[PDB]
Amino acid sequence: FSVKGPELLNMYIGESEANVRRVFQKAREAKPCVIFFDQIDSVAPKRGNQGDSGGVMDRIVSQLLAELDGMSTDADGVF
């Protein structure tokens, strides 16, 4: 499984549940499987470089970290 760079961002507000949540949990739903990323330097801007115009980069980056990390009780091969 993979997402091609900013395949995540989307028109409406509340972008994250429209894609990144559904796919990233789908990788937990799948059997042992990678997620491939490219151009992370486009997907997760350094949050300190704050952005105007809805700051959506903060929304993506927060949801991505929350779904990714900690991984307690969750070592299901999601490389």
Add this chain to the structure above:
Amino acid sequence: EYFFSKNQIMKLNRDLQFSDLSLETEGFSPLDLEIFTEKIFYDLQLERDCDNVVTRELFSKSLSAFTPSALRGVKLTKETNIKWGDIGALANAKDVLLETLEW
């Protein structure tokens, strides 16, 4: 005590005291106690041989595999226990937490 009397002959031996042990859990309705005491009976009736019965240890094990009817549908989780001392360095925070939560 009534349910341990009712459906089938049973005895907890004083290996545990009969009162207090209930407070091993709390979120239970009376309906929960019925099904829970059935789970106890069947589980130890399975893990022990088909002879006479006593609940010690196996109660404390099996209670791990249950949640009350009020909760079972709503999301809940339990972690791989990072016990107090495992994160225990700079205990100051953990102590603040335990103090303020345990009241």
